Design a binder for this molecule. Structure first.
Ligand code: 2C5
Ligand code: HFP
Ligand code: ZN
Lengths: 312, 401
């Protein structure tokens, strides 16, 4: 009905339909702590909602009342719930509600309730027909929206909408390879569909990554990700790699590369290898070029590493 | 000053000549931060790092009793607001009268629900976040009246109304599930002495299940690693004593990696900007991994500093996270609020107090008046308030119904 931000919009306490209802004020107490000086509009819409909630009036004037009390604070759960209760009891059209949530989320895609509401409706209407695309709409306004990627994961898992995701993560990655969200969504698809055990794909991701890792040698994303997969099995299972990296020392260097090398010498020592003193020498070396000059911000970390290898 | 040091300048960003939204936005900040760094060597003044204790005190003192309609969006997080100020004042080592405390107590009361939880304001359905903050705030008081209030019985009843079968917990009846609930429920149930031999079954197992391919922890399995969640996960595991559930070495490398080389502060997720509150969420992870590693019997573990750059983080908070009018904040340019204030101070403290039994090395930077009260790494409340807490409720029974 009356949009809460319309020039015409009028306080409830001045509305007819809301003449039989007595709005109930907030009960902060004799001595109020952290009391908020609510504006008139806000304090109106809620003291009234209090009443409706109070007499669990499953009315329609109320269902409307929640659209407002929600716009005044879309992070108020107690209210999102009563709304859910009204959508059901009032037998309301969930597609209409889809449109509502869609919009209101565009207004605040960094809110927990707006998104939880979306999920529910999709669980009620058992239909994700419009998920992976409205979510891309949001991720188009902010590629790193934590909630957007969370909703997207769910949507994909529940209804098994895999497939075209890599064709999505591949898009955005080219869109900005520094995005860590897409790199996560990447490990998500694969690991959950084709997995990584499959030598081919891995062998494949490995390359692809490396290119980035050698296309933007200072992107800690492609770096954390490359170690992301080879890491489980042992960074020391893959001989080649090392040199294949050492083969960048001059070419493409960064604390990431050197740190990778230190990471490898750490496995190349766990599975009792040969040249301890050369690893447990060239490895302690690095923690130093890192902890002393290259990556000094985490000086106490690096110094710790080289201090660990010593004992064990 | 490590940050004002000349070599530091070489710590800037190398966008490898490839520009993107990520690097770009980081460039904006790296340059912003610079300005405040060279602000000194610019006005030709000697760098003097002080904490406007006095200006933070007035900003808070009153905030704890009244706020503008700008805090309406937190009309459902008032208990949170209490903890943030309260802890802050506590951290600034300020007094909470026998008056105001009682006023607070009485407020959280009405906030509590006859069902067992704590809403985000008088007469609001219970939620685990406000419940967590409520308890915490009531434990920062100590007074019998405070400790009371909390209906331990109904509390477990509530925590039970949320436990899930796969281990995880519900944020609130009808709500969502993310690690936050695990820790929230774990922090309160433990502090209130209401934990049962089953209350937290499968949790440690589901929490760990959140540790992703990048050492960190996400809100829900498959979710990107985040600082607020990783803390909640690790901290929860600590309360449960299942630290050994995660790849501690992998998480460490991840977290340690979250400290910005130039800015000095911590970032919430790899390739995102710096943010004052993560000075606690991220940095606060180190005091815990420390206790766990050592718990494991690690001898190559330090005995004076946390495995993160205390100096630099402390500078950042002081140089670029303080509002001249009071209150701390995200990063320079942003606005002040009590959440960031509370976690900026929290990070500060964590960064200047070390321990390991008899070990106790403090590294207050700048003025020695900037030294704040100590904070507990798990509950984020005075190590004493938590002692009082437990030992007390401990003297009572575990609501075995
Ligand atoms: C902006 N940002 C940067 N880093 C994190 C956030 C962001 O600030 C929201 C938030 N903003 C503010 Cl301004 C205040 C206050 N005062 C409180 C909360 C606030 C609301 C609910 C709970 C809490 Cl703890 C704080 C945020 C979002 C979700 C969660 C969670 N869980 C935490 C922080
Ligand atoms: C409630 C708690 C005990 C702790 C909350 C800790 C957090 C700071 C959690 C962060 C929540 C999220 C997903 C924030 C995102 O919007 P961002 O990564 O931009 O900060
Ligand atoms: Zn923040």
């Amino acid at each position: 009905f009356l949009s809460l931000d319309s020039p015409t919009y009028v306080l409830y306490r001045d509305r007819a339909e809301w003449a039989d209802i007595d709005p109930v004020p907030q009960n902060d107490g004799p001595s109020p702590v952290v009391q908020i000086i609510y504006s008139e509009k806000f304090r109106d819409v809620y003291d009234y909602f209090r009443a409706v909630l109070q007499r669990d009036e499953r009315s329609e004037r109320a269902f409307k009342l929640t659209r407002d009390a929600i716009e005044l604070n879309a992070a108020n759960y107690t209210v999102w719930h009563f709304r859910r209760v009204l959508l059901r009891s009032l037998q309301k059209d969930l597609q209409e509600e889809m449109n509502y949530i869609t919009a209101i989320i565009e207004e605040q895609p960094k809110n927990y309730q707006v998104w939880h509401h979306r999920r529910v409706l999709v669980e009620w209407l058992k239909d994700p027909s419009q998920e992976l695309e409205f979510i891309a709409d949001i991720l188009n306004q902010d590629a790193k929206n934590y909630h957007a990627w969370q909703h997207r994961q769910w949507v994909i898992q529940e209804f098994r909408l895999w497939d075209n995701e890599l064709q999505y993560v591949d898009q955005l990655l080219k869109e900005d390879v520094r995005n860590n969200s897409v790199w996560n969504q990447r490990h998500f698809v694969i690991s959950n569909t084709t997995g990584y055990s499959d030598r081919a794909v891995l062998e494949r991701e490995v390359q692809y990554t490396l290119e980035m890792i050698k296309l933007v040698p200072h992107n800690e994303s492609a770096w954390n990700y490359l170690k992301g997969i080879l890491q489980d099995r042992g960074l020391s299972r893959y001989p080649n790699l090392l040199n294949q990296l050492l083969d960048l020392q001059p070419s493409h260097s960064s604390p990431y590369l050197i740190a990778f090398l230190v990471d490898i010498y750490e496995d190349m020592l766990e599975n009792q290898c040969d040249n301890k003193e050369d690893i447990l020498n060239k490895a302690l070396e690095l923690c130093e070029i890192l902890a002393k000059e290259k990556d000094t911000i985490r000086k106490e970390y690096w110094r710790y590493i080289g201090r660990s290898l010593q004992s064990k | 000053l490590y940050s004002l040091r000349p070599e530091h300048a070489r710590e800037r960003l190398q966008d490898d000549s490839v520009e993107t939204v990520t690097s770009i936005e980081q460039a904006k900040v790296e340059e912003k931060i610079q300005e405040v760094f060279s602000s000194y060597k610019f006005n030709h003044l000697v760098p003097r790092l002080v904490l406007q204790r006095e200006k933070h005190f007035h900003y808070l003192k009153r905030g704890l009793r009244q706020l503008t309609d700008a805090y309406e969006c937190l009309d459902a997080s008032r208990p949170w607001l209490c903890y943030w100020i309260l802890h802050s004042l506590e951290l600034l080592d300020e007094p909470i009268p026998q008056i105001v405390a009682t006023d607070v107590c009485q407020f959280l009361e009405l906030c509590q629900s006859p069902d067992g939880g704590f809403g985000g304001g008088p007469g609001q359905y219970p939620h685990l976040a406000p419940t967590y903050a409520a308890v915490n705030a009531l434990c920062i008081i100590g007074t019998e009246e405070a400790y009371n209030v909390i209906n331990r019985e109904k509390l477990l009843q509530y925590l039970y109304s949320l436990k899930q079968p796969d281990g995880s917990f519900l944020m609130h009846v009808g709500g969502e599930v993310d690690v936050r609930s695990a820790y929230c429920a774990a922090s309160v149930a433990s502090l209130t002495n209401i934990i049962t031999p089953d209350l937290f079954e499968g949790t440690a197992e589901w929490i760990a299940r959140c540790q992703n391919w990048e050492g960190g922890i996400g809100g829900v399995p498959g979710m990107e690693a985040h600082g607020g969640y990783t803390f909640c996960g690790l901290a929860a595991l600590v309360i449960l004593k299942k630290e050994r559930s995660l790849n501690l070495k992998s998480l460490l490398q991840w977290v340690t990696s979250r400290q910005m080389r130039f800015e000095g502060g911590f970032q919430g997720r790899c390739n995102k900007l710096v943010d004052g509150c993560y000075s606690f969420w991220q940095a606060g992870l180190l005091p815990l991994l420390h206790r766990a590693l050592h718990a494991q019997g690690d001898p190559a573990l330090s005995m004076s500093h946390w495995m993160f750059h205390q100096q630099a983080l402390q500078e950042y908070i002081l140089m670029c996270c303080q509002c001249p009018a009071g209150g701390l904040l995200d990063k320079p340019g942003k606005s002040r609020d009590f959440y960031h204030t509370c976690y900026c101070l929290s990070g500060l403290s964590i960064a200047q107090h070390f321990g390991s039994g008899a070990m106790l090395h403090d590294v207050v930077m700048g003025v020695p008046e900037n030294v704040l009260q100590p904070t507990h790494p798990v509950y984020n409340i005075g190590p004493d308030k938590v002692i009082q807490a437990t030992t007390h409720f401990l003297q009572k029974p575990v609501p075995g119904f």
